[PDB]
RNA sequence: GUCGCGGCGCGCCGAGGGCCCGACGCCUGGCGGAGAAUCAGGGUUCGACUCCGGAGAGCGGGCCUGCGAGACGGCCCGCAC
RNA sequence: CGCUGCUGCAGUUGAAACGCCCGUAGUUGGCCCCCCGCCGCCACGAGGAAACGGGAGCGCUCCAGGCAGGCCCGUUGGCCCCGCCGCGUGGGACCGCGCAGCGGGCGCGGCGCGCCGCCGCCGCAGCCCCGAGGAGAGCGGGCGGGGGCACCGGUACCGGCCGGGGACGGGUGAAACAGGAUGAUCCCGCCGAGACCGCCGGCCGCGCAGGCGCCUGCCAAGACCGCCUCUGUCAAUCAAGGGCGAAGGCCGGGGGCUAGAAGGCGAUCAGACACCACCGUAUUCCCGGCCGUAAACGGUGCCGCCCCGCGGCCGGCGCGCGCGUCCCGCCGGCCGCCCAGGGAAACCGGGAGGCUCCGGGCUCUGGGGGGAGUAUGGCCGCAAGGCUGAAACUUGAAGGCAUU
């Protein structure tokens, strides 16, 4: 039984793509079949945040936010709830949930 | 596939079927002649032999019974026999090394039913066929 | 032709003597050492060896240090490279 | 490339007929297929064929009555005996009394009905019902 | 009601020059009015060898895939 | 489709169907030979002759003016070239590439290329042979190559 | 894997079979 | 030489003749066809024996008689038994 | 038993498209000339034993029989079937091919001629199917992580050299082993090697697949699009034959940072000699050969022909329009979804559709499951192995996709 038209992976019009790594398994998948997820999320804690621009001595100063792009493996991402198993009819369905 | 379907190809077509005709294990048993050089009935309905030995075999499961059967070497080729004789308790009618007649037991060289390893069943001892026997119609 | 139709091309002399694994290795550097190599003056593929780290252009007339069996080796190939690199760099 | 043209033209019109498009057009143009075209016209499968004549192979646009069940190329074209183009015909045909095997006779592309009225064999170009 | 018999001349154009019911050339032959000369000089639209004005030296034709651009003052189309 | 490549394209030019000389003509039959033969006498492959006399002339196509070829019009007059312009710009294609060959000794996908390439010469060979264009000598070898281009 | 492993079996099996009939031989 | 053509035997003179359209080699519990069996059609299967044609009379050879047999209910020899 | 498939089988997933490409035989080859010549082809003859199969006629008492019988065809026992790939005759649709310039007289030229020659002789319109939504070649402009050689950047892992400042550092699920007052970790400054090209990086692209990403100079190419450029069937697919082919491996150099098959050591367990630490050889990288395999997979060969909507992306090219990387086509590919249609269904629908209403062409492969990819022979390799490839024997399921 096909599960999927993609079959896991967006490689189309390829035969080879790079290898990366699961960053918590540290294992090799192809980049098209890995998690692939974007945070640019802040340094600091949004409460750490109120109490550091108070400190700061320099005006203008605004939190510096840290960029990601987090891959994790399907095993890694399962188990730790990045994505989810999903319905016969919801695994057709896509878009950011 | 195009099944090759030209006017001129006509030694494709025979050559194609004289190869792939030798896949089916039917027509392979009967025309590659191993079966022949093979059987212990070699192109034989039934053969004369000794009996080796008088040795029961054990079903295979789910049913279980001790199925009274005979080795037997035959006179043509000296191979070994396995042939059950059948009925209810017809071994005790054939003694060690008794003349008997053995016929397939009718799956063509295949095992019939659970006895393993029966190529063949009794048909005839010392000249009196087994049923003859059982229904005392002729006796021993 | 191909008289010899293995790798005993050079080390037919040998003949049934030695081991496979000594004439395989004689094979490259033999071959290697009885070479023409390009001089880097002359530019043209003359440079014989005279006796081991000595080789001579025959049309140039020029002697040049080497390596053993080849006029050059590859870790001065990388050397010379390292040295022009820090050369540069330095000045 | 193109070795049946009359096979790929047929298909064209049995396609056209399924979506119920009156004209079709034919890219590749043959006197076979032209002739083949003539034979249902006249039994009434196909009404009026105009072909488009182009400085190369030429093109045929086919204005279709609906009224073709299926019709059909036989590769490679075979000998039929004249005895034997009845089992052609039991087979390939449905009903002795409607459907037409499309013949080709040293006398002339023809009928199986008019093969079977001077009792000549020859070799099938297709089949139209 | 369409009769492909007579298929429209703007929506025939549409269609691939082959996949038009009479192939048949998607450029027309162009007349250009020299800028050094008061005489149409006939060009093709999809020229690409460089075509020089009659008497100016320089190719007055600047090539590309398709269509060739003009530089000097030109005219449009057959005259 | 495509030969020895797998792309499928149709990028083919659509002849005019009224087989018609040019109406805005200045040219006679005889003033068109002259000037495809006085190309060949300056020496053009015949794809060359077709584009000058469409760009520099307006001779959409040099059957329409005159019922014949551009290589037939050059066979007339006798200057005809000895070996096809289709095969002598593949043996040329060839050539270039050995020549490159020789620098990138490791370059595996210019050989595959020279295969094909070789392949649409030799196959190009047997018909030219065949029609009796080429002499039954005629042979595509790689030492003779170099010199039969030039 | 099972069936890589009963490849890889099957293989010492051919190499013990080849290596004694040289023993033999 | 034969009833006769032929490498059919001999000398002589050349360099052929075959083959992936399967040669050659090997195997066959291979007589061949007329026919037989089974069967919508197409196929499949089998050809000891009636009819025909072959081939042999334990096995190889070799022969005379005759219009015709390389005969075996002829002869001769080698080999078995 | 259409489970041998010419009719008439299957290969996405039940068995099964060669990993990929060139390629010789082989097989298959768009249209197109009416008018004959050879083909093949088809019909019609002729001739070549019956029995036999069929069948006319017939009461063996019925029959299986037999050609008998009856107050008689000249009583019967007809007639068909020796496939006769031979033969003769017609037709020319289809199917293969045909190289000659033809003529008029000399010539009625040795029983009718014809052949060969000789005569420009003035008779001939004396002589080119065409331009395949086949293929090859050209030109033009773009196209892309396509290839080789070349050059060189950047941190990071690692080592090394200071300087500072100070007890742990590591590692983990928790641990433990190694590191540290000869000052580790940590910080910064350098210094050197080797690997790798991050985030941009994709329903992006390119390559015959395998595969493809620093500066990417310079060297040849390749598709695609455009065109009133050129050639004129030059084609499609393919045994035999060649090339290429991830990784692992191998032979021999160069290298050697990082990971790390082996191995060693902590732990973990009943035992792990396994999973998890930690250390680390081969290897990983480069060159010169091998090897020839991968779930080399779209698990779907290749060349076509048609086939409905709805969008996206990339590469050209046109149609216009105020006018924007806008619209609309043509597109060459990459894709999603899908009505019919198909299937055992999952699902395909740019096909896995046009198929029991079964036939475009070509090459490969499969025939219940094991035994077995074994045995043996061959070939190839240095090896590991690869390629080809059984049989005895055994046995009622194995398997697919779905439902609860």
Redesign the pocket.
């Known amino acids: 039984?096909?599960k999927r038209?993609?079959?896991g992976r967006?490689?189309?019009?390829?035969?080879?793509?790079?290898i990366?790594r699961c960053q918590n398994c540290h294992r090799c998948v192809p980049?098209?079949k890995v998690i692939?997820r974007?945070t640019i999320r802040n340094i600091v804690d949004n409460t750490i945040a109120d109490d550091v621009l108070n400190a700061c001595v320099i005006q203008g100063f605004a939190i510096p936010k840290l960029?990601n792009?987090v891959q994790y493996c399907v095993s890694c991402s399962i188990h730790n709830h990045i994505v989810r198993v999903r319905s016969?009819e919801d695994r057709?369905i896509?878009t950011p949930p | 596939?195009?099944?090759?379907?030209?006017?001129?190809?006509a030694?494709?077509?025979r050559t194609?079927?004289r190869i792939?005709?030798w896949?089916?294990?039917?027509?392979?048993?009967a025309?590659?002649?191993?079966?022949?050089?093979?059987?212990?009935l070699?192109?034989a309905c039934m053969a004369r032999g000794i009996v080796t030995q008088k040795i029961g075999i054990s079903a295979?499961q789910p049913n279980s019974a001790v199925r009274k059967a005979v080795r037997v070497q035959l006179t043509k080729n000296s191979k070994k026999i396995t042939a059950f004789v059948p009925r209810d308790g017809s071994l005790t009618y054939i003694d060690n090394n008794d003349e008997v007649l053995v016929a397939g037991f009718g799956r063509a060289?295949?095992?019939v039913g659970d006895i393993?390893?029966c190529?063949f069943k009794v048909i005839k001892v010392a000249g009196i066929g087994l049923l003859a026997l059982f229904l005392r119609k002729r006796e021993k | 032709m191909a008289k010899r139709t293995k790798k005993v091309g050079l080390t037919g002399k040998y003949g049934t003597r030695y081991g496979r694994?000594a004439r395989?290795?004689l094979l490259?550097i033999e071959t290697s050492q009885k070479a023409k190599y390009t001089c880097p003056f002359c530019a043209k593929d003359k440079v014989r060896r005279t006796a081991c780290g000595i080789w001579t252009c025959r049309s140039c007339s020029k002697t040049m240090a080497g390596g053993a069996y080849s006029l050059h080796?590859?870790?001065a190939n990388?050397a010379r490279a390292?040295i022009r690199?820090?050369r540069l760099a330095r000045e | 490339?193109?070795?049946?043209?009359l096979?790929?033209?047929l298909?064209?019109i049995?396609?056209?007929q399924?979506?119920g498009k009156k004209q079709v057009?034919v890219?590749?143009?043959?006197?076979?297929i032209?002739?083949f075209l003539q034979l249902m016209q006249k039994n009434g499968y196909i009404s009026d064929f105009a072909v488009v004549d182009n400085?190369?192979?030429?093109?045929i646009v086919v204005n279709l009555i609906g009224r073709l069940?299926?019709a059909?190329?036989?590769?490679?074209?075979?000998?039929?005996?004249?005895?034997d183009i009845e089992?052609w015909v039991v087979?390939?045909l449905?009903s002795r009394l409607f459907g037409h095997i499309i013949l080709?006779?040293?006398?002339?592309?023809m009928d199986h009905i008019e093969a079977q009225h001077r009792?000549?064999?020859?070799?099938v170009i297709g089949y139209f019902? | 009601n369409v009769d492909l018999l007579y298929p429209d001349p703007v929506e025939e154009?549409?269609?691939?020059?082959?996949?038009r019911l009479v192939?048949g050339?998607?450029?027309?032959?162009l007349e250009i009015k020299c800028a050094g000369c008061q005489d149409i000089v006939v060009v093709?639209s999809?020229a690409?060898?460089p075509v020089f004005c009659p008497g100016c030296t320089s190719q007055i034709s600047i090539?590309?895939?398709?269509?060739c651009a003009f530089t000097s003052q030109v005219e449009r189309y057959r005259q | 489709?495509?030969?020895?490549?797998?792309?499928?394209?149709?990028?083919?030019?659509?002849?005019?169907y009224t087989?018609a000389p040019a109406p805005w003509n200045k040219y006679t039959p005889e003033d068109v030979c002259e000037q495809i033969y006085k190309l060949a006498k300056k020496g053009t492959?015949?794809?060359?002759?077709?584009?000058i006399?469409?760009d520099q002339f307006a001779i959409?196509?040099?059957?329409?003016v005159?019922?014949?070829?551009?290589?037939?019009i050059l066979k007339a007059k006798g200057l005809a070239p000895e070996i096809?312009?289709?095969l002598y710009?593949?043996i040329k294609?060839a050539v270039?590439?050995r020549?490159?060959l020789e620098?990138?000794?490791?370059?595996?996908?210019?050989?595959?290329?020279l295969?094909?390439?070789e392949?649409?010469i030799?196959?190009?060979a047997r018909?030219y042979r065949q029609?009796r264009?080429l002499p039954p000598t005629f042979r595509y070898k790689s030492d003779q190559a170099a010199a039969l281009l030039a | 894997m099972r069936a890589k492993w009963?490849?890889k079996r099957?293989?010492?099996?051919?190499?013990k079979?080849?290596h004694m009939?040289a023993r033999s031989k």
């Open positions: 039984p096909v038209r993609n079959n967006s490689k189309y019009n390829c035969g080879h793509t790079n990366v980049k098209d692939k974007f960029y792009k016969r057709k896509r | 596939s195009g099944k090759t379907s030209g006017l001129y190809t030694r494709k077509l194609i079927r792939q005709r896949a089916d294990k039917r027509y392979r048993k025309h590659l002649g191993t079966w022949l050089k093979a059987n212990p070699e192109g295979k060289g295949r095992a393993p390893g190529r | 694994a395989k290795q490259k080796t590859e870790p990388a390292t690199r820090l | 490339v193109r070795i049946n043209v096979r790929d033209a298909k064209s049995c396609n056209a399924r979506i057009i890219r590749p143009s043959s006197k076979v032209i002739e400085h190369r192979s030429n093109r069940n299926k059909g190329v036989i590769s490679p074209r075979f000998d039929i005996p004249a005895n089992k087979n390939l449905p080709t006779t040293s006398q002339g592309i009792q000549i064999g020859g070799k019902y | 154009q549409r269609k691939h020059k082959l996949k192939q050339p998607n450029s027309y032959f093709y999809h690409n060898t090539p590309t895939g398709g269509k | 489709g495509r030969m020895h490549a797998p792309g499928k394209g149709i990028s083919r030019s659509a002849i005019p087989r492959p015949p794809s060359q002759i077709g584009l006399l469409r959409g196509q040099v059957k329409n005159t019922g014949s070829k551009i290589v037939r096809p312009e289709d710009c593949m294609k270039a590439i020549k490159h620098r990138s000794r490791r370059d595996k996908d210019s050989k595959f290329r295969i094909l390439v392949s649409r030799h196959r190009l018909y029609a264009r | 009963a490849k099957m293989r010492k099996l051919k190499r079979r080849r009939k």
